[PDB]
Structure 1
């Protein structure tokens, strides 16, 4: 016998039965199989898979990430479901990827969010060369709007990277993938973890983290996409970047204005590093 799929939420609303057009609770196929139409595979890793699908419910498009294998235990389950809790903590914001719903069936977690344009990373590798700076500024601003929304709620993304920023057509963009998001001070179902080492803030090397870590992460995110360079995973080059230095190559082809802003974001000392609000308050970054 099989447990039925059940909604995963932390809002405290009723415990409720997942139902959908095309979904027969009798039939053995999963809720995701019956209630959706897999259109393409957006990605795959050890996290599982992301699918571009069309809901049989409202007929519209979404992205659904399903975990790869059943939960290994209670603790393993709690930490996976926490991603939903995080995403729900973000709430409604135009610069943040919106969560539609989530559910679990057979130890597998399904996360259904809005379908976005390609990630900044995908858009960058497709563009071939450096992005126009007018584009880059728009990317920098929308992510800062997203960060300020997170940071004003005591939330830290902790894994801001080009692959987490999605081109909102056009040419806006949204911050998503809240798997590592922590609410400062109430942590946590699971312990906090650093993000991608390529974009990691220097203070995390000694176990320190605040909202400032995101600002640094966004800095190297923008540096990567605007120079079309590739960031080191280690060594002196990596360590130079965390010491206020710039790659001796230097960001050539970048203006003074954009360079001076990145310096504010790439500041080694967290307490000196600019905040998102202060950055957005500059004038070179208004609407």
Structure 2
């Protein structure tokens, strides 16, 4: 029996088919991986198109179930913000967790691969703005995403982007590992705060604006975490963008800029 999942219609219960196969039509499989599978679907009760994620394998034990279900709780804490992917409903059946979210466009990672070049700064600034708006919303409620990267930012109409994948989200006041390429240096010493997301967004913007593959480790990983940007790729960057990037990549989290401060800056105002 399927049961809804929260931390706050074609039913056919008798029929021997899953609620997913009974309440929705799988138009496409947007993606797949260890997390499971993401499908493009249209509600068989509302007709509107939505995105659904399902886990690959059934719950192994009590812990696996709790760890997976936490994303629902984390998604609920984020709430409804214009620049954050909104969750409609979440449920479980057969040891499988399902999350139904608004259908968004392609990820910033995909868009960048297709463009195959440094994105125009006009698009870049807007993504920086909306993502900063989203982070400020999370930071105000004592939430840290910890996995800000191109793949977790989804594009929308008229050059707008929304933040998603709140699985690694932690409420300031249990932490999972994130991608080393985008992690703030303070995390190595266990210092976790909203500043970390800002640094991740900085490397995110640097990656898409200079078509630069971020280093997983080594000296290159260090150079980007010493407050000095590499002049070889940052050549085409405008003076204004570079200054904003230096603020976000400030090694010391105590001195690093905050989202609201950056958003208040004139270049990033509206």
Flag as ranges the 4+ runs of structure 1 deviating above 3 A: none
Superimposed CA distance per residue, residues 48-89 of structure 1 (whole angstroms, 9 cap, x where no aligned partner)? 111111110100111111001111111111111000000000
Match of 1:42 in 2: 30
Q: Kindly indicate whether the alpha-carbon contact (under 8 Å) linking 2:202 and 2:248 is maintained by their aligned counterparts in 1.
A: yes
* In structure 2, distance between residues paired with 1:246 and 1:161: 18
Please identify, of 241-250 and 92-101, the stretch whose mean Cα deviation from structure 2 is larger: 241-250
Gaps of 5+ in 2: none
Q: Which of the two has greater helix per residue?
A: 2
1:179 aligns with 2:162: no
Superimposed CA distance per residue, residues 137-186 of structure 1 (whole angstroms, 9 cap, x where no aligned partner)? 000000000000000000000100001111121111100110011111xx
Deviation at 1:286, TM superposition (A): 1.1
* In structure 2, distance between residues paired with 1:113 and 1:55: 11
**Counterpart of 1:24 in 2: which secondary structure?**
coil
Deviation at 1:34, TM superposition (A): 0.8
**What's the TM-score, normalizing by structure 2?**
0.98
Q: Kindly indicate whether the alpha-carbon contact (under 8 Å) linking 1:215 and 1:265 is maintained by their aligned counterparts in 2.
A: yes
Match of 1:264 in 2: 247
Q: Kindly indicate whether the alpha-carbon contact (under 8 Å) linking 2:3 and 2:93 is maintained by their aligned counterparts in 1.
A: yes
Superimposed CA distance per residue, residues 120-153 of structure 1 (whole angstroms, 9 cap, x where no aligned partner)? 1111111121111011000000000000000000
* In structure 1, distance between residues paired with 2:21 and 2:203: 39
**What's the TM-score, normalizing by structure 1?**
0.92
- Equivalences for 1:179-258 in 2 at 5 Å? 179-184=167-172, 191-258=174-241
User: Aligned-residue CA RMSD in angstroms?
Assistant: 1.2
Q: Kindly indicate whether the alpha-carbon contact (under 8 Å) linking 1:215 and 1:276 is maintained by their aligned counterparts in 2.
A: yes
Q: Kindly indicate whether the alpha-carbon contact (under 8 Å) linking 1:237 and 1:247 is maintained by their aligned counterparts in 2.
A: no
Q: Kindly indicate whether the alpha-carbon contact (under 8 Å) linking 2:212 and 2:233 is maintained by their aligned counterparts in 1.
A: no
Q: Kindly indicate whether the alpha-carbon contact (under 8 Å) linking 1:194 and 1:200 is maintained by their aligned counterparts in 2.
A: no
Deviation at 1:29, TM superposition (A): 1.1
**Counterpart of 1:244 in 2: which secondary structure?**
coil
* In structure 2, distance between residues paired with 1:167 and 1:84: 22
Match of 2:7 in 1: 10
Deviation at 1:245, TM superposition (A): 2.3
* In structure 2, distance between residues paired with 1:194 and 1:273: 22
Deviation at 1:194, TM superposition (A): 3.1
Deviation at 1:248, TM superposition (A): 4.6
Q: Kindly indicate whether the alpha-carbon contact (under 8 Å) linking 1:212 and 1:270 is maintained by their aligned counterparts in 2.
A: yes
Gaps of 5+ in 1: 12-20, 185-189
Deviation at 1:206, TM superposition (A): 1.3
